Amino acid sequence: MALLGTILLPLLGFALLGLFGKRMREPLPGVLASGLVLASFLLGAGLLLSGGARFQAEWLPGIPFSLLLDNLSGFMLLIVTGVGFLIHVYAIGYMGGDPGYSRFFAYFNLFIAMMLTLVLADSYPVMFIGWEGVGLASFLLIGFWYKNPQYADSARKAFIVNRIGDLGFMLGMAILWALYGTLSISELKEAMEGPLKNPDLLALAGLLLFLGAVGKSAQIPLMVWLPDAMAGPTPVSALIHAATMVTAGVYLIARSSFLYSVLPDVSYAIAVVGLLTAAYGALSAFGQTDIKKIVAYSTISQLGYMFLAAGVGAYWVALFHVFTHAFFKALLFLASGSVIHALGGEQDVRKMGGLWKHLPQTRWHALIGALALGGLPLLSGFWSKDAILAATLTYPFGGVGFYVGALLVAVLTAMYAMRWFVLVFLGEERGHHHPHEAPPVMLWPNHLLALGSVLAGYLALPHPLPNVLEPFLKPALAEVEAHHLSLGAEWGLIALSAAVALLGLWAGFVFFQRKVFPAWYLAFEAASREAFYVDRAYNALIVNPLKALAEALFYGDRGLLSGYFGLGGAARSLGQGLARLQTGYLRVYALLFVLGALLLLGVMR
């Protein structure tokens, strides 16, 4: 019941801003929102500290309503509600003088409540309330300033492309019901102890579940929806890209670890898609000429890293990275939000540069952040990245092919991060803005993130060094694994991660300060800005043909009705043919008569 409290608080709260909301002055909705998130984080962390929590109740027969709060759930709850809280308090600042304060924070509480319903769920359908709910709240928020045609289609694409994966979720969900008949993650895990059954079919279910995950965490092929999610206010992008949404993509794999750990075939594909998403996202990352999109592609890529982690059987690691990332991505986005709250939403890069002096404290934010993403050897993103890279080699499913790839991507990530920082804060100036106006409630929570960024790192250090994130996560879920490691070899790897990271960062610092970009940085700034021409290809035989087929089948249906009318006219024709039999001539009547008599007589005897 109290567990359900954590969910109901940002809903009992949400409803007030929709029902009333405009009835209030304009520091308030943010205060209520952030207050309920405050006492959701808090009064759910009390539960976590109390050892955990449960809820089971009335729903459709055979499919009960269950919330489980364990370690794996508590971790997500703290990430979501905490980082979410900070982003709320920031949003109190960045959203100001904007009508729809109530709309914004109602949608925010809605979002939080949905995400909590997602993570706190012991049955896949309740989790599905979570998924569709969060997608819906994303839709509402991406198209927040609705008076814009672009910032509507953005959200449309969100709640459609996402629903493509949601369909897979449903399908696999049904397979794991025809098969087992429980549909509750706990008893679905306990029934998957043993020999399993129809492993091919089980693989199918897990594969559709994964194809579900793809949309929500914006992996390929459903990658395409996320860059367009930039439309909504900046802190919305922060929540979607860091603390919520895409996190569920990984989290679903982590809960369903009992299912994927027994699937050699599928996990391989999961890791491969993870790496492909990472590489793609990273290559098309830096070509972006917008501060927003260029970070969105880092979201896509990094989540690719996570799916590569969870792919190879290292489930606790993917969440470590999810955590660090939850900090430094929120940091990055909120930083950019402050930056364009300072430039009046200029939101460009080549039209920017040299904000180093004029912007106090923001430069440090974006530097700590961009370096954490780059993987500065004594920062979070570093430890998570080397954790993943080593987990590649050490775990089942090979990882030797993957490792080198993830390393190249590890270079490229540093490169585009430094492109971002340089292009934003360095190299002369363009435009006009005066004093500061990077206010308390914007830089204050943004400060706290930068701390969390640096110190997220050592919660899980390599083997001999104290690791507290593994013994917390593993008991809750994902227990089965086979990992061989060697001391000093692994440190050769960690040192390689550090060296290559520093190297990449350093290269990026000069390369994207350069001002001369020869031959194929034209041939790269084109493709990469256009995401390697992927959307243009998705509207090739995927979208527009279907869009056309709607009309095609419409007019077809019109033709069907038309044909029925044709039957009508057939009866009309036959009818006026039978009525044409009566000429009015009596001799004719006599002929038809005698004929008829002969007919009836002919039938009987």
């Binding site: 929709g18 009335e58 729903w59 459709l60 027969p61 055979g62 359908p125 599905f128 309330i129 569709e132 709910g133 819906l136 839709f139 198209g143 609705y146 008076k147 045609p149 509507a152 289609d153 449309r156 709640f159 459609i160 629903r163 493509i164 949601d166 369909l167 449903m170 399908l171 049904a174 397979i175 019901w177 025809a178 869009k547 087929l549 709607a550 009309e551 089948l553 419409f554 077809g556 249906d557 069907l560 009705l561 029925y564 009318f565 009508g568």
Partner: protein, 467 residues
């Protein structure tokens, strides 16, 4: 008890037709609503409030009524939907009496405990349906009407051949459902009887090639679309299958079942797919209804207690939000003047949380969990996959199309650039919103309570298809 609840809209409607005014009939829809709701929260089991009276005995025809778990749920659904239509209205050419008349006719239709009386109501309800189509709106009133009427009746009258055969070939004493079931037909008799039920029920479901009456019908009714809501409550086909066509001639249902699952599936996908192209709320909602019924019929046709319960539930709950979307389309029509989606773009900010009401409804329609559509859609998926996984998938290449049409229409009708402006929300429209969303949220959040009575009927009429 039952006959009181069946007759109450009929008399109030009759008192309305001649007598007038509206309000006395609106509180009539309210009285029927409260009575039916009270009836939902009371009954223990299948029999409920039985009724048996002689009608033609010697023919075997009796006035027989009663509330299954199913009948109760539909009495609630219908009473609610029609009531919402009543207090919102803006039709009120005093044919809200015709509306209540059709309500009572449908209530009798679902309470009908014997075949011939069921038939009686099935066809009798056609009368208001055709009237409020003729004399209350539409340029193409006449073609929509003769199409709708001729379709349902060309399906219907040959069913009479089957309803007779159901009793005659089985040697059943009367037309009572119980007796008819106590006397099974043999093969190639059960075949024919099931077929004769099946054309009339598929065409009134509607299934794919037999749905062509649906778009003209929904266009040419009064632009408010009360008659459209009630037309959607007259979509009793799936229910008719489940209660009647299938149990009375299962041997034939077995042969037809593959084809039926097929038609249901592609009806869902097709409906939702061409629903995109619709350039007016009437056509859009119509094809959307075709999709939903596709899903429901898929649920029933599967066997599978899950799927059947899901399908019936989906029908029930979709009555409310489909009727509601129709009524709302009428309410923005009244303030704008057209059911064209494109013209008069941005309405939100001019209108209050009317955007919220419309969006809640659209989300219920696309079947967002927590709203009425999802529970039924989901149990249906569960059962369909059991029956034929491939058609479950084909049919469920739907949710994509649903989000497509619903969100496209919603965006182009509400979200975009500000127009002239509008009214906010009427004192009636507020009752509408409140009661509606209350309903959607309750049936979506507690699909436990509703459909408890669906459970025994589901598994029993599933085992019917077993040994």
């Amino acid at each position: 008890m039952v006959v009181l609840a069946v007759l109450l809209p009929v008399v109030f409607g009759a008192l309305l037709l001649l007598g007038l005014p509206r309000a006395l009939g609106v509180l009539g829809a309210g009285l029927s609503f409260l009575l039916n709701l009270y009836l939902f929260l009371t009954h223990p089991g299948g029999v409920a409030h039985a009724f048996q009276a002689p009608l033609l005995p010697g023919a075997g025809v009796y006035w027989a009524f009663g509330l299954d778990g199913l009948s109760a749920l539909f009495f609630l659904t219908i009473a609610l939907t029609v009531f919402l239509g009543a207090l919102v209205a803006r039709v009120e050419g005093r044919f809200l009496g015709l509306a209540l008349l059709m309500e009572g006719l449908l209530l009798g239709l679902f309470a009908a405990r014997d075949l011939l009386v069921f038939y009686v109501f099935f066809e009798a309800a056609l009368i208001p349906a055709l009237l409020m189509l003729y004399l209350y709106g539409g340029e193409g009133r006449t073609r929509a009407l003769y199409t709708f009427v001729l379709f349902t009746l060309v399906g219907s009258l040959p069913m009479l051949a089957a309803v007779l055969g159901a009793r005659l070939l089985s040697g059943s004493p009367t037309f009572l459902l119980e007796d008819l079931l106590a006397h099974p037909l043999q093969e190639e008799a059960a075949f024919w009887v099931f077929l004769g039920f099946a054309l009339a029920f598929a065409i009134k479901t509607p299934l794919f090639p037999l749905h062509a009456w649906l778009p003209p019908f929904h266009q040419e009714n009064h632009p408010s679309g009360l008659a459209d809501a009630l037309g959607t409550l007259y979509k009793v086909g799936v229910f008719a299958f489940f209660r009647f066509a299938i149990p009375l001639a299962p041997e034939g249902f077995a042969q037809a079942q593959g084809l039926l699952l097929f038609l249901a599936a592609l009806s869902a996908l097709y409906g939702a797919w061409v629903a995109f192209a619709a350039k007016d709320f009437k056509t859009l909602l119509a094809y959307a209804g075709l999709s939903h019924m596709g899903v429901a019929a898929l649920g029933v046709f599967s066997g599978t207690p899950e799927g059947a319960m899901g399908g019936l539930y989906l029908l029930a709950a979709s009555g409310v939000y489909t009727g509601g979307l129709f009524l709302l389309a009428g309410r923005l029509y009244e303030r704008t003047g057209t059911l064209e989606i494109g013209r008069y773009r941005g309405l939100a900010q001019s209108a209050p949380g009317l955007a919220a009401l419309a969006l809640i409804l659209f989300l219920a329609m696309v079947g967002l969990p927590g709203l009425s559509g999802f529970p039924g859609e989901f149990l249906t998926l569960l059962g369909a996959y059991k029956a034929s996984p491939w058609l479950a998938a084909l049919a469920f290449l739907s949710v994509i199309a649903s989000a497509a049409y619903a969100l496209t229409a919603f965006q182009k009708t509400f979200w975009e650039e500000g127009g002239s402006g509008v009214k906010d929300l009427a004192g009636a429209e507020w009752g509408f919103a409140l009661l509606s969303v209350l309903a959607l949220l309750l049936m979506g959040v507690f699909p436990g309570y509703f459909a408890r009575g669906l459970h025994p009927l589901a598994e029993a009429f599933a085992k019917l298809l077993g040994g």
